[PDB]
């Protein structure tokens, strides 16, 4: 078959892949990005389509404008299980037309020298001499089966992790996902009968009975259009998520016009710390494939762009040292862990705590205000549950006279702090990875026991 040579092959054109291509463009490298979907459908994976504005600023990512921005967001309303307590968290964000913005990032990258092949699937990994050296591609637009050699492969295939799962299991880059370390999520976009009240605010409903292990949401895409859905924890033996959706939709969205359904669908959502290493010999993994999703609120589009940024930086470093080993690409880990990874690890622990709380716990915690918005902002943005904040919450929890998991909040905060420092001390070289990973596992397995 025909053979082509590129500096970098990016597999997947989602938020992760497109950002990597964008950040790498116009810097002396010959880059190819491929995606199985047609151009017009790239980026249309079921999503809430809510992304913080801060991510676009930090990474120098172009703001979503025109038809790419459906609704401006100025905050989030958080509802208690009994709907009695409502927390308001202010902050600027965007409700996106995800495919439209995704395709512009691709189009701009293409205008900057990046070659993009749609309707192209990476079938077989080229793994020779202990290295990832490219992939076999099938372009069904031209019915060609091409062999493409690259110095670095950027695996950005989303939750399917379809490419790296075909690599030898001895590679640390083939680390798989535990069922309980993920959520299944489902959403629909419908027009509403009445205009949406406070349509510039997202709505999140916490309820372990209507959405166990996750939450319900109501994300306005306009004055009369809303992205409504839910997420539940996988590996728990829960019935189909659509059973939950169909049963409790009217409670969280009584205003929707069910005859005006625009889109519907669901997918898997990783909810844990990222891959212990997101780089190895000749390969970097980003996005959902590298588990870059926020373990608490399930947001992954912002951190996917971050992973693409770090992938670009690491690859440039590799070419400047002529070293495409794990060691040569190791800055990928250092960059991402400091930018978002260390936060994920802390929130990974906090998630396990939150998912085991009862509705009574959450009702009590919110009504009695165990934490304030100043620290809630600090919590899900820096991953830090300050010990002073936990102490203040524990003094309130001490007023509870019934048995509750809430009483372990101080211990949870200490565990979050411990694993946070452990990730900030990420191994400088691949030779220290195994020792560090086992130390992380010990912290996690210990914490799981402490919740019982
Ligand atoms: C229902 C629901 C709701 C939400 C969310 C998820 C879900 C399922 N998330 C998470 C968010 O959707 C997700 O984390 C990111 O879109 C991940 O971006 P990626 O580019 O990694 O994956 P993504 O799946 O978007 O990209 C993968 C791409 O690779 C392609 N591909 C796969 N295998 C291939 C192969 N072998 N060859 C070629 N191409 C291949 C696919 O075709 C696809 O285009 C979210 N996030 C957030 O921040 N805000 C929110 O509101 C939500 N809400
Ligand atoms: C539904 C699933 C699976 C995930 C959703 C993920 C979420 C909640 C995304 C919300 C993103 C968004 C639009 C946030 C806007 C509201 C907000 C509190 C933003 C905070 O970000 P910053 O702008 O940095 O906050 P500051 O106000 O401190 O600057
Ligand atoms: C986890 C379960 C079952 C319930 C809790 C679900 C919660 C508490 C979600 C919290 C929503 C929240 C306060 C989000 C923080 C605001 C925000 C979206 C900031 C921007 O996101 P980043 O990508 O972290 O930056």
* Domain range annotation of the chain: 1-452
**183 C-alpha to ligand 1 centroid (Å):** 14
Can you give 114-156 as a three-state secondary structure string?
CEEECCEEEEEEEEECCEEEEEEEEECCCCEEEEEEEEEEEEC
Contact 137 CB / ligand 1 (< 6 Å) = no
Cα(first)–Cα(last) distance of the chain, in Å?
Answer: 58
**Does the annotation flag 377 for ligand binding?**
no
CB of 119 within 8 A of CB of 125?
no
**Does the annotation flag 300 for ligand binding?**
yes
Backbone phi and psi for residue 331, each to the nearest 5 degrees, phi listed first: -65, -20
CB of 111 within 8 A of CB of 28?
no
Triad 419, 407, 75: Cα angle to 5°: 70
**423 C-alpha to ligand 1 centroid (Å):** 25
- Find all residues with CB under 8 Å of 206, minimum gap 6, and list them: 78, 79, 80, 81, 215, 362
Sign of the Cα torsion 187, 192, 195, 197 reads negative
User: Going by CA atoms, what residue is nearest to atom 51 of ligand 1?
Assistant: 48
**56 C-alpha to ligand 1 centroid (Å):** 17
Pair type for strands 31-34 and 69-79? unpaired
**379 C-alpha to ligand 3 centroid (Å):** 9
User: Going by CA atoms, what residue is nearest to atom 22 of ligand 3?
Assistant: 381
CB of 10 within 8 A of CB of 156?
yes
Contact 73 CB / ligand 2 (< 6 Å) = yes
Report the nearest atom of ligand 2 relative to the CA of 92: 23
DSSP helix/strand/coil, 32: strand
Round to whole Å and give the CA distance between 344 and 177.
15
**207 C-alpha to ligand 1 centroid (Å):** 25
Report the nearest atom of ligand 3 relative to the CA of 208: 3
Triad 203, 205, 208: Cα angle to 5°: 165
**Does the annotation flag 46 for ligand binding?**
yes
**Does the annotation flag 150 for ligand binding?**
no
Report the nearest atom of ligand 2 relative to the CA of 187: 1
The residue to mutate among 15, 49, 50, having the most atoms of ligand 2 within 8 angstroms of its beta carbon, is 50
Residue 24 vs residues 15, 170, 190, 234, 304: alpha-carbon distances, Å: 14, 29, 37, 35, 15
Round to whole Å and give the CA distance between 291 and 300.
9
Burial class (CB in 10 A: 0-12, 13-18, 19+), 161: buried
**Does the annotation flag 15 for ligand binding?**
yes
Round to whole Å and give the CA distance between 171 and 439.
19
Alpha-carbon 227 to chain mean position = 18
> What is the H or E stretch that residue 187 is in?
strand 182-192
Considering every ligand atom shown, identify the ligand nearest to the alpha carbon of residue 307 and give its number.
Answer: 1
The resolution in Å comes to 2.1
CB of 103 within 8 A of CB of 42?
yes
What is the CATH class of 1-452? alpha beta
């Amino acid at each position: 078959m025909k053979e082509l040579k590129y500096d970098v092959l990016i597999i997947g054109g989602g938020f992760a892949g497109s950002s990597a291509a964008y950040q790498l463009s116009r810097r002396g490298l010959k880059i190819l990005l491929v995606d199985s979907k047609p151009w017009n459908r790239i980026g249309d994976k079921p999503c809430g389509d809510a992304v913080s504005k801060a991510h676009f600023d930090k990474l120098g990512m172009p703001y979503p404008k025109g038809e790419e921005l459906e609704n401006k967001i100025n905050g989030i309303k958080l509802y208690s299980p009994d709907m009695q307590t409502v927390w308001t968290v202010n902050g600027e964000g965007f409700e996106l037309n995800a495919p439209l913005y995704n395709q512009r990032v691709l189009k701009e990258a293409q205008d900057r020298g990046v070659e993009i092949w749609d309707l192209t699937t990476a079938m077989k990994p080229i793994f020779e001499d202990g290295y990832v050296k490219g992939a076999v591609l099938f372009n069904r637009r031209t019915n060609e089966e091409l062999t493409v050699y690259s110095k670095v492969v950027v695996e950005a295939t989303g939750y399917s992790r379809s490419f790296r799962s075909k690599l030898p299991p001895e590679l640390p880059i083939t680390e798989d996902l535990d069922d309980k370390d993920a959520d299944v999520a489902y959403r629909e976009v419908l027009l509403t009968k009445e205009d949406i009240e406070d349509h510039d605010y997202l709505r999140i409903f916490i309820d372990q009975e209507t959405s166990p292990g996750g939450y319900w949401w109501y994300f306005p895409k306009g004055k009369n259009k809303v992205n409504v859905g839910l997420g539940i924890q996988g590996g728990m033996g829960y019935p189909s998520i659509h059973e939950y959706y169909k049963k409790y939709l009217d409670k969280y969205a009584p205003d929707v016009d069910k005859s005006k359904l625009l889109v519907k669908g669901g997918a898997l959502v990783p909810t844990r710390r990222p891959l212990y290493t997101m780089a190895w010999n000749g390969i970097i993994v980003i996005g959902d494939s590298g588990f870059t999703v926020n373990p608490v609120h399930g947001g992954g589009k912002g951190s996917a762009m971050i992973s693409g940024y770090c992938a670009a930086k690491a690859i440039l470093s590799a070419f400047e040292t002529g070293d495409f080993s794990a060691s040569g690409l190791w800055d990928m880990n250092i960059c991402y862990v400091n930018e978002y990874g260390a936060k994920q690890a802390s929130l990974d622990i906090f998630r396990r705590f939150l998912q085991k709380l009862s509705n009574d716990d959450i009702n009590y915690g919110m009504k009695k205000k165990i934490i304030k918005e100043e620290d809630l902002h600090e919590a899900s943005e820096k991953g830090d549950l300050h010990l002073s904040v936990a102490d203040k919450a524990m003094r309130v929890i001490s007023g509870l006279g019934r048995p509750s998991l809430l009483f372990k909040l101080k211990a949870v905060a200490e565990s979050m702090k411990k694993i946070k420092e452990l990730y900030l001390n990420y191994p400088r070289s691949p030779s220290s990875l195994g020792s560090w990973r086992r130390e992380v596992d010990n912290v996690l397995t210990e914490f799981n026991k402490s919740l019982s």
